[PDB]
Amino acid sequence: SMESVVTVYSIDGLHDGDNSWYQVQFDAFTKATGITVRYVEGGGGVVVERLAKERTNPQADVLVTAPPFIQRAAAEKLLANFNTDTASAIPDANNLYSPLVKNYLSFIYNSKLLKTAPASWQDLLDGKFKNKLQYSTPGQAADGTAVMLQAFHSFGSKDAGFAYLGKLQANNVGPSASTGKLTALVNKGEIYVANGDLQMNLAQMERNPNVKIFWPANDKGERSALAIPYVIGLVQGAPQSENGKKLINFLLSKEAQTRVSELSWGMPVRSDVTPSDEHYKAATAALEGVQSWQPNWDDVAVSLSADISRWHKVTES
């Protein structure tokens, strides 16, 4: 006989614990099918670089990563054509990849010290934020990359978003290789405002009682949040393509999707699920009146490295 297997390479965030969405779903899938799930986790670009390294003899069957890395995988011919069973249930799926779990860029502030959420991007330039605001470093921290993209959108052009971030640098404490550690700094008032992502921050609120989630408005009064979903595809040349297809369809099923919020603090991509958990209530409350948006990710895949280089030039100078 053989122990049947399928191998997942994923961006981190869905396997944080024994009761995480991936652990629970992988265990259910194995019980139902006899297929063990092997799992590798890393940064969103790291996992795609590994697929490219391994392309002459693929090891993974299923990729999960965030934009623009999923689009880089598609451009590099690392994804296989596969029309999922669900897709009718899922917005914006295509034959190479499908959204799996929704997430968003977010910001946080100290609500004990500040009487209300900062209203606008302009308010963050106030001198009261000098050395009392910090966001993580574009390119190094995924949510820092998201802040840069968000500035372009909120200010209407790359030049204008970079100009804004150059001004914000007067207040920004400095670089941070990761984002999650900033939350406790906000909670202690060492800083008053930081970036984040919605899944992460929702889960942090219980132990950070001085913090609340917010988004600044732009000069048209709009609060928007960059959509940074987890996105799934089948690996080109997978050694276990049939098992990969089964797992993809399973993770996109109504059954699996019903527990995304409960187990991970993410949001399901299917519209036909009704979460029953309190995490979802918190997510819905945070997003009320916030507009999701996204760029053309095929275009961002090409321009991102240049933009990160420019961020360094703009802020360091």
From Swiss-Prot:
Q: Name one GO cellular component term.
A: outer membrane-bounded periplasmic space
Q: Name one GO molecular function term.
A: thiamine binding
Query: Keywords for this entry?
Result: Periplasm, Signal, Transport
SUPFAM superfamilies, per the entry: Periplasmic binding protein-like II
GO biological process, any: thiamine transport
Keyword Signal on this protein?
Answer: yes
Q: Per its UniProt record, what InterPro entries does this chain match? A: AminoethylPonate_ABC-bd, SBP
- Cell location: Periplasm
Superkingdom classification of source: Bacteria
Print the miscellaneous field: Maps to a phosphate-starvation-inducible locus previously known as psiC.
Family per record: Belongs to the bacterial solute-binding protein 1 family.
PANTHER family given in the database record:
THIAMINE-BINDING PERIPLASMIC PROTEIN, THIAMINE-BINDING PERIPLASMIC PROTEIN-RELATED
The identity of this protein, by name, is Putative 2-aminoethylphosphonate-binding periplasmic protein
Query: What is the organism of origin for this protein?
Result: Salmonella typhimurium (strain LT2 / SGSC1412 / ATCC 700720)
Q: Which gene encodes it?
A: phnS
